[PDB]
Amino acid sequence: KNPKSDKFKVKRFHHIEFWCGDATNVARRFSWGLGMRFSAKSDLSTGNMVHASYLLTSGDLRFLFTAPYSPSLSAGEIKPTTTASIPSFDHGSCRSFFSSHGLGVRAVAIEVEDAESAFSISVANGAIPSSPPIVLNEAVTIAEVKLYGDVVLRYVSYKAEFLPGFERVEDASSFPLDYGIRRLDHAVGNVPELGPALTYVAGFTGFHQFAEFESGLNWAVLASNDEMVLLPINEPVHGTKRKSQIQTYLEHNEGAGLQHLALMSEDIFRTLREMRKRSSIGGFDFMPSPPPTYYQNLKKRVGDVLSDDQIKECEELGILVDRDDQGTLLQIFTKPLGDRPTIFIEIIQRVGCMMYQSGGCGGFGKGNFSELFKSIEEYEK
Amino acid sequence: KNPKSDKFKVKRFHHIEFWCGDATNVARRFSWGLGMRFSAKSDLSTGNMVHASYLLTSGDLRFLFTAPYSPSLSAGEIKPTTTASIPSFDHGSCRSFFSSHGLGVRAVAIEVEDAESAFSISVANGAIPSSPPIVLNEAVTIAEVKLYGDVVLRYVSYKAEFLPGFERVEDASSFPLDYGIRRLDHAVGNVPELGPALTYVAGFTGFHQFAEFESGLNWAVLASNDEMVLLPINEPVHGTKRKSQIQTYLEHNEGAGLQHLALMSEDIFRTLREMRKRSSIGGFDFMPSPPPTYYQNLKKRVGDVLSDDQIKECEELGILVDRDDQGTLLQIFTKPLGDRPTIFIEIIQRVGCMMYQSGGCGGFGKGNFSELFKSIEEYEK
Ligand SMILES: Cc1c(C(=O)C2=C(O)CCCC2=O)ccc2c1c(=O)n(Cc1cccc3ccccc13)c(=O)n2C
Ligand SMILES: Cc1c(C(=O)C2=C(O)CCCC2=O)ccc2c1c(=O)n(Cc1cccc3ccccc13)c(=O)n2C
Numbered sequence A, B: 001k002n003p004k005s006d007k008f009k010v011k012r013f014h015h016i017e018f019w020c021g022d023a024t025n026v027a028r029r030f031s032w033g034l035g036m037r038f039s040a041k042s043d044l045s046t047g048n049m050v051h052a053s054y055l056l057t058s059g060d061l062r063f064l065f066t067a068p069y070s071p072s073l074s075a076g077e078i079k080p081t082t083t084a085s086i087p088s089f090d091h092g093s094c095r096s097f098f099s100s101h102g103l104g105v106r107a108v109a110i111e112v113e114d115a116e117s118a119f120s121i122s123v124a125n126g127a128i129p130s131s132p133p134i135v136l137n138e139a140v141t142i143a144e145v146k147l148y149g150d151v152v153l154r155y156v157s158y159k160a161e162f163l164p165g166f167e168r169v170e171d172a173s174s175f176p177l178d179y180g181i182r183r184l185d186h187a188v189g190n191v192p193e194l195g196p197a198l199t200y201v202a203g204f205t206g207f208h209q210f211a212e213f214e215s216g217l218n219w220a221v222l223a224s225n226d227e228m229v230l231l232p233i234n235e236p237v238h239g240t241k242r243k244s245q246i247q248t249y250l251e252h253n254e255g256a257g258l259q260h261l262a263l264m265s266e267d268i269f270r271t272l273r274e275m276r277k278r279s280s281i282g283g284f285d286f287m288p289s290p291p292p293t294y295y296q297n298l299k300k301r302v303g304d305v306l307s308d309d310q311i312k313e314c315e316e317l318g319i320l321v322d323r324d325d326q327g328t329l330l331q332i333f334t335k336p337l338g339d340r341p342t343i344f345i346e347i348i349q350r351v352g353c354m355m356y357q358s359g360g361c362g363g364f365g366k367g368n369f370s371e372l373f374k375s376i377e378e379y380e381k
């Protein structure tokens, strides 16, 4: 069931912005670890005396890394005279965010038809305003409302290159890395209480609950009209023998925030071979692979979708596989991206649901919780 | 002239500690950019609820990257019950340092015979105490005094693996990168006033001025008895046409601090080939190469030390060459290591002064200031 109840016209995920203490070092690590190219910058070299912001791209995926400079560099400026390319930026907010949460996502940005309208209708429908709509060089409009914790949902709309005041990056400094990652599939938040978080976000967006099919959590997924903007939300389940990883997140993050980003690959096998080659030379680590009983159970569940060869390749790379009633999901999880056991990345590929591929084809891996437990015990043999 | 006036027995540089907002991402970038192996860690996985610290090594060079966790993880602890492996660490100090300075060096650590004695004699001779001597697991003694700005000189002494409470890193996670870097040659500070900085540091160490042989700066080098611990210090020269890079440092750093680390390579050509291969894929960038007139002037100054082939190789890699009365210096400078135009790295190799090689053989590149200007104008032809 899809009521198509969006209160304003939503297009696609546009970008994700990390707030950092040093944007250079995070951006360079991510670039090499994920195979993303340096494509735009806004910093001292472009006249920005407020913040350093570096943009990585792979396909349609856009990762933005931003850190504050000394406030003294811009102490003479006022908002009407600011050199910041992102007018919502605030030194105090950024430093407070990073000292409270460590490295993580500040903004989940979606492109909309009209960012000013999205902002007003959102706020009219319960959204807590974060930064009012501002028109940049008469070309791009940017507005922000609170999403959860200190994460904002950022509306971006274009009259008609990333943002004004960003410069394309020199081709010498811009090496065309590509491991097959192509777009953001979903972005997932952890909160202490799922009900009120859902009521709030669905309340100001009109996003609807995405239909799906006892370990750790409860969740629900909010979706836009064409279900291409997908925002799952988790809450912890307390009292378990094994302490909820959602609760560990909340403790180490100092409250709610973004838990994982799921990046669609056009060839998850190429992506994982490439990322795994680089894990111990500056890239990203992956969670421990499932036991071979898990892959010794894959024939009976997806034997009609993947060959024996493609299954063995899943076993080599530690890939997980789930299926719903319309499609199949290949997925794998990184270890946390920084010091704290908080944010991590998921790589996914979806097969099925062809009409273009419909959003969320195969679900989000709900079945792999039960399957992982079962195969763990079967390998215990 | 070397009075050998050290007020306590100094051995060698031991390590350099960067204070970070996220230590994981800086450490992984540095590891790949410099070819340094992950060798020890102290973090949540080792029981440290206070700070995350990761150690990179290449030869005898030791780079330590440390960031604070949420204070809430250790709110129940007191100093007698701390889980920090570095007892001088303070959340408030670390966050204040990084927000004021951005990414940079907090500690220049030297190994001494007796860290408690070095501390007392230092403080008795004008050193401002930063952290008193503390004995770790009855095996290692650690003490800190102020050096300049918010940088400390850290004394480390061993009765008899890095520090207690650090764990050796798994060989899976520890890839044996090596681009030829072998030890720290010198560590250089920028201050507003050279005279008082020298009087202070030479005052509490007994370090002597290292003898050498109008662009930007004045400097002097402090040295230990065998001149293997080398601490140059710069001050800006004001009123120039070209604004002093020392003054730019002080403005963007919010005052005094460490300007560059000079890393000796056993094969600067291999090191620079390897680092330059990686500049645009997550490593380090290098300052703009000198004009070919500079290399077209190298025959007349070092033609007795480097072949024509070894000179052309200098031209390919952008290496600079200087000479004093006892030896020859090959050197090159990276662009800044992080967002701000503050700290950078120098790669060097020294040839001559064999007895072992004596410290500072060839100097620090004083002559390359005049030579660079001259060759710039000659290429202007
Ligand atoms: C993150 C995720 C998803 C996922 O994407 C996701 C959505 O998009 C929206 C719905 C809620 C949700 O969850 C699906 C399955 C997952 C994981 C995962 O993170 N984990 C890893 C793991 C969790 C705890 C403890 C662990 C201990 C060791 C190793 C892994 C651990 C899984 O096992 N499954 C099976
Ligand atoms: C950092 C250094 C040293 C050096 O090691 C050092 C010591 O150890 C102790 C003594 C003081 C000192 O200085 C020696 C020579 C150097 C540089 C250097 O940094 N630079 C780079 C540069 C400086 C300004 C403006 C620049 C603009 C563009 C490119 C480079 C620029 C040089 O040119 N020389 C020639």
Ligand SMILES: [Co+2]
Binding pocket: A186, A188, A260, A262, A346, A364
């Ligand atoms: Co997911």
Ligand SMILES: [Co+2]
Binding pocket: B186, B188, B260, B262, B346, B364
């Ligand atoms: Co130097």
